[PDB]
Design an enzyme around this catalytic site. Structure first.
Site, PDB file in Angstrom:
ATOM      1  N   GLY A 206     -36.596 -32.773  16.082  1.00 47.80           N
ATOM      2  CA  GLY A 206     -37.775 -33.535  16.301  1.00 47.80           C
ATOM      3  C   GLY A 206     -39.102 -32.867  15.880  1.00 47.80           C
ATOM      4  N   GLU A 207     -40.182 -33.462  16.369  1.00 48.88           N
ATOM      5  CA  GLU A 207     -41.495 -32.888  16.193  1.00 48.88           C
ATOM      6  C   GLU A 207     -42.512 -33.330  17.229  1.00 48.88           C
ATOM      7  OE1 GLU A 207     -42.058 -33.935  12.072  1.00 48.88           O
ATOM      8  OE2 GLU A 207     -41.540 -36.019  12.785  1.00 48.88           O
TER       9      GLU A 207
ATOM     10  N   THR B  28     -47.201 -33.418  17.267  1.00 47.42           N
ATOM     11  CA  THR B  28     -48.446 -33.061  16.559  1.00 47.42           C
ATOM     12  C   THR B  28     -48.523 -31.545  16.175  1.00 47.42           C
ATOM     13  OG1 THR B  28     -50.808 -32.665  16.980  1.00 47.42           O
ATOM     14  CG2 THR B  28     -49.471 -33.241  18.981  1.00 47.42           C
TER      15      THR B  28
ATOM     16  N   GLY C 148     -45.955 -29.252  15.538  1.00 47.43           N
ATOM     17  CA  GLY C 148     -45.101 -28.880  14.404  1.00 47.43           C
ATOM     18  C   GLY C 148     -43.672 -29.271  14.732  1.00 47.43           C
TER      19      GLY C 148
ATOM     20  N   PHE D 147     -31.956 -23.468  24.631  1.00 48.56           N
ATOM     21  CA  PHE D 147     -31.575 -24.766  24.123  1.00 48.56           C
ATOM     22  C   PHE D 147     -31.070 -25.671  25.256  1.00 48.56           C
ATOM     23  CE2 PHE D 147     -28.322 -27.750  22.530  1.00 48.56           C
ATOM     24  CZ  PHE D 147     -29.097 -28.482  21.594  1.00 48.56           C
TER      25      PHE D 147
ATOM     26  N   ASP E  12     -48.512 -34.230  31.357  1.00 49.55           N
ATOM     27  CA  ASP E  12     -47.780 -35.051  30.415  1.00 49.55           C
ATOM     28  C   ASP E  12     -46.364 -35.262  30.857  1.00 49.55           C
ATOM     29  OD1 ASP E  12     -47.640 -36.816  28.153  1.00 49.55           O
ATOM     30  OD2 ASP E  12     -47.230 -35.169  26.750  1.00 49.55           O
TER      31      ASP E  12
ATOM     32  N   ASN F 177     -40.122 -35.549  27.901  1.00 51.76           N
ATOM     33  CA  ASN F 177     -40.476 -34.167  28.136  1.00 51.76           C
ATOM     34  C   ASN F 177     -39.608 -33.491  29.216  1.00 51.76           C
ATOM     35  OD1 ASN F 177     -42.461 -34.330  26.096  1.00 51.76           O
ATOM     36  ND2 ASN F 177     -44.172 -34.506  27.528  1.00 51.76           N
TER      37      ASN F 177
HETATM   38  C1  SQ9 Z   1     -34.237 -33.406  23.177  1.00 53.44           C
HETATM   39  C2  SQ9 Z   1     -33.200 -33.000  22.344  1.00 53.44           C
HETATM   40  C3  SQ9 Z   1     -33.020 -31.639  22.026  1.00 53.44           C
HETATM   41  C4  SQ9 Z   1     -33.789 -30.651  22.498  1.00 53.44           C
HETATM   42  N1  SQ9 Z   1     -33.224 -29.600  23.125  1.00 53.44           N
HETATM   43  C5  SQ9 Z   1     -34.216 -28.784  23.465  1.00 53.44           C
HETATM   44  N2  SQ9 Z   1     -34.180 -27.616  24.135  1.00 53.44           N
HETATM   45  C6  SQ9 Z   1     -35.333 -26.967  24.396  1.00 53.44           C
HETATM   46  N3  SQ9 Z   1     -35.300 -25.834  25.046  1.00 53.44           N
HETATM   47  N4  SQ9 Z   1     -36.514 -27.458  23.984  1.00 53.44           N
HETATM   48  C7  SQ9 Z   1     -36.541 -28.660  23.333  1.00 53.44           C
HETATM   49  O1  SQ9 Z   1     -37.730 -29.211  22.872  1.00 53.44           O
HETATM   50  C8  SQ9 Z   1     -38.651 -29.639  23.907  1.00 53.44           C
HETATM   51  C9  SQ9 Z   1     -39.958 -30.128  23.256  1.00 53.44           C
HETATM   52  C10 SQ9 Z   1     -39.631 -30.866  21.932  1.00 53.44           C
HETATM   53  C11 SQ9 Z   1     -40.727 -31.850  21.550  1.00 53.44           C
HETATM   54  C12 SQ9 Z   1     -40.744 -33.074  22.598  1.00 53.44           C
HETATM   55  C13 SQ9 Z   1     -40.305 -32.651  24.015  1.00 53.44           C
HETATM   56  C14 SQ9 Z   1     -40.707 -31.119  24.256  1.00 53.44           C
HETATM   57  C15 SQ9 Z   1     -35.393 -29.333  23.058  1.00 53.44           C
HETATM   58  N5  SQ9 Z   1     -35.129 -30.506  22.435  1.00 53.44           N
HETATM   59  C16 SQ9 Z   1     -31.942 -31.276  21.220  1.00 53.44           C
HETATM   60  C17 SQ9 Z   1     -31.046 -32.202  20.692  1.00 53.44           C
HETATM   61  C18 SQ9 Z   1     -31.236 -33.536  20.994  1.00 53.44           C
HETATM   62  C19 SQ9 Z   1     -32.299 -33.940  21.802  1.00 53.44           C
HETATM   63  S1  SQ9 Z   1     -32.339 -35.706  22.135  1.00 53.44           S
HETATM   64  N6  SQ9 Z   1     -33.540 -36.366  21.664  1.00 53.44           N
HETATM   65  O2  SQ9 Z   1     -32.280 -35.944  23.665  1.00 53.44           O
HETATM   66  O3  SQ9 Z   1     -31.110 -36.337  21.391  1.00 53.44           O
END
Ligand code: SQ9
Lengths: 257, 298
Positions: free
Chosen positions: B13-14, B16, B18, B84, B129, B134
């Site tokens: 994902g992303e 704003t 990065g 993760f 937020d 989140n």
């Molecule tokens: C969330 C996720 C993840 C995912 N695992 C994650 N693990 C951590 N520690 N941080 C993340 O980002 C948090 C940050 C990213 C920007 C928006 C929210 C705060 C993660 N995102 C890995 C595979 C699939 C999925 S998902 N969309 O549920 O299929």
């Protein structure tokens, strides 16, 4: 008092961990306490010109004292350290921090925009990103809730005294923000209302007039001598109506502790 | 160089800010989430959001708050290394749309979220937020607060902070009304909305605009007046022309909930921030008497 006690207890733990090295200036081959006073006084002026929070000023000074605790700096670069610290404090603390260009402008083109941005990054590396430091201002603000009654002259005078402590590394480095706040508050209370460090604050802080006395004696002397200090920007700022002209008040001649 | 030990697995994902990748440590086998942050090296430097997120996450060390593992500096990029987590609450709710999330799991998740939030609040941090996107879950029943990009360290008492905060659907009425001061209550409101959402399987207040959002809240909770919210009519954006809707009975707002759940929910959604329940006091609520830790089915 929703989370007031937990927060106070937590900041009491953190002021110990985010405290600069007390000795540091003696270890700097090129800079002195007198140069640092000049810099902080200049930061005061920048805060006024950009209408920054007082909290921003107190954070910036903490970042500079921590940075100088670990890095040797030549005097020609001291202002660069301070410009970057103030930029970081603004980014941390302000809703609308001024843009980088304004920080380049305010140094009279001594430094380049690249220099400021590179210094920003180095300051962050040296502090390892640990920017949420407790300041004299954060404790004063909580101490203010114990006022009987609330008094806007007492508040501004307290802030003024706390700010004066920023200027003089010797002796104020020796004291924790919580203690400097206690001294400033009591000294303000006494000057304005003849009154004393609240019983409810003894309970909260665990500090008494007895424990505050060393800081107090220094602070009272600072106050009486403020009109003659080479640095004058804090006295000027505190002449304005915004601060009820508190720097114009007569310091008490004695404390009767 | 400094990233030589990380093998990118995929983009997840992303923002704003990065890009977010899943990566593995080639030497240890550890799987991580990497957030890449561009430095504005000829213009603005390190962004204020990253500065706040990093400094605040380095302080917050709790089972229900995402772990920052490392911060890797280059001249042009900053990499945040996080533990993760399997997925977010948003995607879990979508996977659960047909069945619903069982009530023991909802209880467990809310419990943990409140524990994380109480920890923040006790350490003078507002999240600002909270939303399902989140909140990150693992395969063992844990849930953690994440994306501290909009967070901030607050003072006691607070001063005026940034007005543009919290995604619209989860935004507290005091913010919508333009109040001078706001405090931890706004996070509790968010959590209340998320609780209802878990339960009914749809957003509680899906407004299309600021005024719409506000009216959706009024239509559900009743238009507030001086008796329920002393001071409401004095707010910068309060308007006497606001229609005056009657409050609806909570067993219609959240049909599947028990008396206890309803009691909790109404306290999380109380209008007056000074009466809205704290995370800490919510931890003590009878709703939580029998909480367990079920494993979700992923
Ligand atoms: C969330 C996720 C993840 C995912 N695992 C994650 N693990 C951590 N520690 N941080 C993340 O980002 C948090 C940050 C990213 C920007 C928006 C929210 C705060 C993660 N995102 C890995 C595979 C699939 C999925 S998902 N969309 O549920 O299929």
């Amino acid at each position: 008092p929703d989370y007031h006690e937990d927060i106070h207890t937590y900041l009491r733990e953190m002021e110990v961990k985010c405290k600069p090295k007390v000795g540091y200036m003696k270890k700097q081959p090129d800079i002195t306490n007198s140069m640092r006073a000049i810099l902080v006084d200049w930061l005061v002026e920048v805060g006024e010109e950009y209408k920054l929070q007082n909290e921003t000023l107190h954070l910036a000074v903490n970042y500079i004292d921590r940075f100088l605790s670990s890095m040797s700096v030549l005097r020609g670069k001291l202002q660069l350290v301070g410009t970057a610290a103030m930029l970081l404090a603004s980014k941390f603390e302000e809703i609308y921090p001024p843009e980088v260009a304004e920080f380049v402008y305010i140094t009279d083109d001594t430094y380049t925009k690249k220099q400021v941005l590179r210094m920003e990054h180095l300051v962050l590396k040296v502090l390892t990103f640990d920017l949420a430091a407790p300041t004299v201002n954060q404790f004063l603000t909580q101490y203010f809730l114990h006022q009987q009654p609330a008094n806007c002259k007492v508040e501004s005078l307290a802030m003024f005294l706390g700010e004066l402590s920023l200027i003089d590394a010797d002796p104020y480095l020796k004291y924790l923000p919580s203690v400097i706040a206690g001294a400033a508050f009591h000294l303000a209370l006494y000057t304005v209302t003849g009154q004393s460090w609240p019983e409810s604050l003894i309970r909260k802080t665990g500090y008494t007039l007895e424990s505050l006395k060393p800081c107090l004696m220094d602070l009272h002397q600072t106050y009486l001598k403020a009109p003659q200090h080479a640095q004058q920007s804090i006295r000027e700022k505190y002449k304005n109506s915004k601060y009820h002209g508190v720097s114009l008040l007569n310091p008490p001649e004695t404390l009767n502790l | 160089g400094s990233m030589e030990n990380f093998q990118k697995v995929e983009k997840i994902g992303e923002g704003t800010y990065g890009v977010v990748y899943k990566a593995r440590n080639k030497l240890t086998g550890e799987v991580v989430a990497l957030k890449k942050i561009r430095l504005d090296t000829e213009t603005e430097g390190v962004p204020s959001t990253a500065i706040r997120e990093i400094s605040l996450l380095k302080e917050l060390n709790h089972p229900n708050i995402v772990k920052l593992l490392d911060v890797i500096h280059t001249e042009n990029k900053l990499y945040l290394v996080f533990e993760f987590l399997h997925q977010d609450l948003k995607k879990f709710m979508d996977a659960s749309a047909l069945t619903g999330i069982p009530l023991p799991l909802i209880k467990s998740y809310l419990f943990q979220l409140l524990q994380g939030l109480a920890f923040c609040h006790s350490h003078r941090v507002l999240h600002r937020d909270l939303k399902p996107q989140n909140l990150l879950i693992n395969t063992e029943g844990a849930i953690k607060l994440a994306d501290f990009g909009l967070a901030r360290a607050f003072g006691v008492p607070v001063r005026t902070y940034t007005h543009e905060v919290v995604t619209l659907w989860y935004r507290a009425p005091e913010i919508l009304l333009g109040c001078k001061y706001y405090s931890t209550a706004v996070d509790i409101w968010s959590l209340g909305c998320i609780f209802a959402e878990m339960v009914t399987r749809r957003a509680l207040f899906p407004g299309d605009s600021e005024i719409d959002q506000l009216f959706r809240i009024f239509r559900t909770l009743g238009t507030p007046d001086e008796v329920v919210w002393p001071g409401v009519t004095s707010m910068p954006d309060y308007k006497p022309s606001f229609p005056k809707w009657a409050r609806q009975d909570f067993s219609k707002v959240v049909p599947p909930l028990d008396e206890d759940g309803r009691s909790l929910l109404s306290q999380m959604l109380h209008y007056d921030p000074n009466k809205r329940i704290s995370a800490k006091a919510a931890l003590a609520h009878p709703f939580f008497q029998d909480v367990t830790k079920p494993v979700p089915h992923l």
